Amino acid sequence: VTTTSGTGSEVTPFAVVTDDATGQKYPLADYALTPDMAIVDANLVMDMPKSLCAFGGLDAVTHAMEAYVSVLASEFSDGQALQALKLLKEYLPASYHEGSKNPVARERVHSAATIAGIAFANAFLGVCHSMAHKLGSQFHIPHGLANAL
Amino acid sequence: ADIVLQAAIAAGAPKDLIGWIDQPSVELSNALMHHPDINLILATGGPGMVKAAYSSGKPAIGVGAGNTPVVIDETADIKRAVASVLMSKTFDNGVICASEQSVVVVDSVYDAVRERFATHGGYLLQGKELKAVQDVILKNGALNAAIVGQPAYKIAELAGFSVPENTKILIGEVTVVDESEPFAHEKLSPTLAMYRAKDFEDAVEKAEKLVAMGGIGHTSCLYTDQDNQPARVSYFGQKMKTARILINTPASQGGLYNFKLAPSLTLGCGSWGGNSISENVGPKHLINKKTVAKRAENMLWHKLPKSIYFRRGSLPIALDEVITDGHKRALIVTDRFLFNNGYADQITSVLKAAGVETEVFFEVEADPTLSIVRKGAELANSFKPDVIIALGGGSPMDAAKIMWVMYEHPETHFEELALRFMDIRKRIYKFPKMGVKAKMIAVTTTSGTGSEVTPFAVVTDDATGQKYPLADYALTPDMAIVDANLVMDMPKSLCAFGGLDAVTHAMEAYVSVLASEFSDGQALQALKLLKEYLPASYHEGSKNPVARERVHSAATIAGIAFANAFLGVCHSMAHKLGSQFHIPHGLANALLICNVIRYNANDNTKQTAFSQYDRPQARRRYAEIADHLGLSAPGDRTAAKIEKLLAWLETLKAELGIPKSIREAGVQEADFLANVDKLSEDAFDDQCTGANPRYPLISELKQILLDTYYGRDYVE
Amino acid sequence: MAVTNVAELNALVERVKKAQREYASFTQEQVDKIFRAAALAAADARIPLAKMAVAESGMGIVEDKVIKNHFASEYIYNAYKDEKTCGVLSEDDTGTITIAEPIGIICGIVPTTNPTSTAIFKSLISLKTRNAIIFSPHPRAKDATNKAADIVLQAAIAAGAPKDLIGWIDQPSVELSNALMHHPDINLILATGGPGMVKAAYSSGKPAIGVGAGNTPVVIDETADIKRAVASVLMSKTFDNGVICASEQSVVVVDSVYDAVRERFATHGGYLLQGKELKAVQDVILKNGALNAAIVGQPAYKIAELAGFSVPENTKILIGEVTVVDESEPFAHEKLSPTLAMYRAKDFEDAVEKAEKLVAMGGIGHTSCLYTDQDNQPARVSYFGQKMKTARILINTPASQGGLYNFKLAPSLTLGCGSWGGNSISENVGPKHLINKKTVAK
């Protein structure tokens, strides 16, 4: 069950853990870790501030902008990556200035975060999401900023 | 009543909550029943006022009492049953309702109970005094009130014959049972009626008339040995029509009797007519329950097979995974044409090398007829497979899903699934769980049908010729192989046959009312590449391998979308045409797609509350295709924007090699006008019309079929 | 063989008696098998029967009767599929057995409104509870009901059922149907239709239940959606020309949004009228003392020609503007035609009061709908349900059904009561009113 709009971690088989004594990452990836049922609800994202809708949404934009250009892109995922970018270019601005006062835009943005999740579950992320994965861990900046600048 | 009132008054109740009448009269009580402020009557007593209670124009229930018969046979305990009835009739002078009123005994033991009764508490009478008591109970054609509840001895003084003080009850010996005999009616006095039975069988018959004479069946009790004669008690219950069937048990109660029995009263009925069984009145007959319903928003879904594999030569590698996993037994479902070719060794040989038991199923033809699927299930449960691998596109892959259900649930009849699961829009009934002892692998052989990814199955019955569609998200295969090396030599006359089927498969799911943001991108990606090298896959076939591979993966992409959003009406007359003209599917929806689009963009009788305000429109959704596919001027109008889309659809047929109208597609005028009416109002009911936002009418589903016959273009 | 008068009815009923006597011994095993085959033939024979259900009736349209026949034929084999109605029902050790027994021959009146939708519903619950029915349809729609009953019969015949288990009368008459109700061999009556014969069914000295229809009011206040409630009611009243029982019969709107609806209705599908033709419309539905049979199920435009004034073809329904609510004005009674009544409310509070009188006028409370915002005004919906007396409370929901609406709702019919009026609430008739359970005690 997803309570954030912008990270597609409910449909993808990716998980990262850190060591206790030391600090190097322990990434894991096996199609078998995908949940056998994912619930995408929008009423769980209604009052989160205009400082998490702006970083999750950009995280979703980054999640799909390079899955279309990744070397692992097939004719099965460019149909979904090209849709999230189309969907977020007309609802993310409307879900930031107006916030919950426009509930249709929030639902569209939340639903299109999982679509990018489908896109990057099969194709894999580029260098933009790897350097951003470390630069957001040493300087303790949230995930969503690092791939935005 | 006042005691209960005052108890309730000092507990929080209003002051005049219970009322009663003083010095009542028949005229005063009548005004109470006809009062328009009273909406229930609880009537108790004999058929003196309960009969009038029913004929009052108001809902009423009556706690009546019918003469309960007692049956004692030769196998019963005589010494014990004589006294259980004896004490139950002397309880409150036998006034408690639904008490004993008659005893029926066989001739084998009749003499035994006669002197026993006179010995313990009875006093029999047979002379002139016998026809004295009967005249006492009935005086004016109705029961008198001068002997109700009185002890037995005093009522004998009324008739003039002395009876000793110690005597408990008085009993007559009467054979004729009717109205003129007054000893069968309810008496509410310590008296009993004794009846002559020649055997057990007539005893029950002689008890049927007694219950029927009381009008309402309340209780029945017979005394018998319940341990060595268990059939007699079972026979006794299916013949008497009463709410209670007691054995070796007093009717009302004792003075260690059974404690969890409802009282004789609190058992009412709602009719004075015959064959009426009483029921226990409780705080449900005096209560009315209302139900509210809230308009709950509907949620969509996106359900797909767990794994989909696709590339040039992806069958052996995907098949290998199955070998590595534990899978010993597997069967392959196939058609006829491909087996005589080298299209079956490329899957069996790779299986035999690893070593697994595979069998041949080569009898499925173009349309499954419920006869070969049954024999397939018969072969399935005679082999106990662990993996079901489908082969072929369309017919042999749809039938494999039904074989899977019938193999995993042999007890469930097919005709039970014909009314529960026929449309994927309801979610209140669940399929029995599947995949317990098998799993489905789906492989395609033709480019342009995504049936390996959808939860759809259509079964024809060869007896009459009726289709039984099945649809639920449990028949979806657990794996789909999309390989292209097996399509390098398909005839150019058929590569595009299914190719245009996918065009209508994707174009129709985009404008469906169930279309969501999840299935819109895939429905659009399929159309985008089909104008790029699908015609190349037609003219080249083998001169351009890559185009055929690219088109083949698009059929699943078209199918991956409509498996979540049902097709519209175009895929309905397509079903109907392809099953009576024997034309193949793919052609049927090809030459009327250029005529059903215009019947979806106009003013138009439309279904309301959906596809009118919830969804934007259908005319502008087709407008997105013309600009998504890039065939629109920078500045143009929507009305003219669809025109160029239809123009592209027409001029692609100039090299697609498809007929211009249905008549030129190999059908005759003679066998159309006499069959169009029969053909029209069945496409209206093939689980379509969920999509195609416009609500169709039979009057407007024929002009389409008549307009396409002569090649004429529809216009109003 | 055909039956002409009482002389052959008094022999037809004996055959059904003899078949019922033998059929009562069947067990649960082959009773469900007969249930399966009967439900299939009802669903598989929906279109043909609906085409010939309007050829002689002359009212309604074929399109909407297909769904009505299909929904009613599959809903019965959807919740009563597997429940113990034969043999032993339960067992209490305490030895307490609770076997159940059927009732017997059942009478049934099929109205001209739904000659086949309710004919197959009644026929499909009796053979589930091991009893038999005799049908007495209207002379206008006799041939449609008889065919529907015969289809289920022949389906059950080739499943293990006795020969003469379901009967019907040809060329029926009022005097012939009276002899069927007073027959001492029938112990249940299922009466349906308007208050024309159900009143006589109650006054018959026999147990009887009636699937009636009260004029259901719809309440729309100022806070409700105005562009959505106009259409949900509009499509639910044009369903089969508004003959579906317990459909909309009157709308009550507050003064705030009255004119906001008046132009909308004329814009979309309505045609308002206020002149002398309003009197004509009132008189065109009363031939004498009650509702006439010449405008039942007819489209809106033709009845206007009979009423005198011309109305365009495209128009869907016609609606009057009447303030008085009594008997003299006939616009409050059930009409079974694509017509609606529009009422004046000064506020929401009087709207519910103006709806109490409408429900009480129908005699039996069946359904009542309110259109309001259910998310920021939750007190109003709670208040609305404790004031009316109806079996169903619907908010933001069409009365009968749609053409992705709610699926787990019982049909408008299969909801009967046991009294005419006096604040009576209907209930869903099912395979428990036709069964009697006996208890044995050891």
Author numbering:
A (entry chain C): 595 to 743
B (entry chain B): 150 to 404, 408 to 756, 758 to 869
C (entry chain A): 1 to 94, 96 to 404, 408 to 446
Quote the paper.
Here we present structural convergent evolution on fusion enzymes of aldehyde dehydrogenases (ALDHs) and alcohol dehydrogenases (ADHs). We discover BdhE (bifunctional dehydrogenase E), an enzyme clade that emerged independently from the previously known AdhE family through distinct gene fusion events. AdhE and BdhE show shared enzymatic activities and non-overlapping phylogenetic distribution, suggesting common functions in different species. Intriguingly, despite distinct quaternary structures and < 30% amino acid sequence identity, both enzymes forms resemble dimeric structure units by ALDH-ADH interactions via convergently elongated loop structures.
While most eukaryotes, including humans, possess separate genes encoding ALDH and ADH domains, some bacterial species are known to harbor AdhE, a previously known protein family consisting of both ALDH and ADH domains. The ALDH and ADH domains of AdhE are most closely related to EutE and PduQ families, respectively, and are thought to have emerged through gene fusions of the ancestral single-domain ALDH and ADH genes. With this unique domain composition, AdhE forms helical filament structures as a homopolymer, termed spirosomes initially reported in 1970s26. The results revealed that BdhE formed a ring-shaped tetramer, while AdhE formed a helical polymer, even though they were purified in the same condition. However, through modeling the structures of BdhE and AdhE, we revealed that both helical and ring-shaped structures consist of similar structural units of dimers. Both the BdhE and AdhE dimers showed a bent shape whose bending angles were different. The slight structural difference likely contributes to the substantially distinct multimers, as the larger bending angle in AdhE compared to BdhE may prevent single-turn circle formation and instead promote the assembly of open-ended helical structures. We found a gap in the tunnel wall formed by a BdhE dimer, which were not found in AdhE dimers. In an AdhE dimer, the linker of ALDH and ADH domains filled the gap, while the linker of BdhE formed the elongated loop (loop 2 in Fig. 4a and b) and thereby remained the gap.
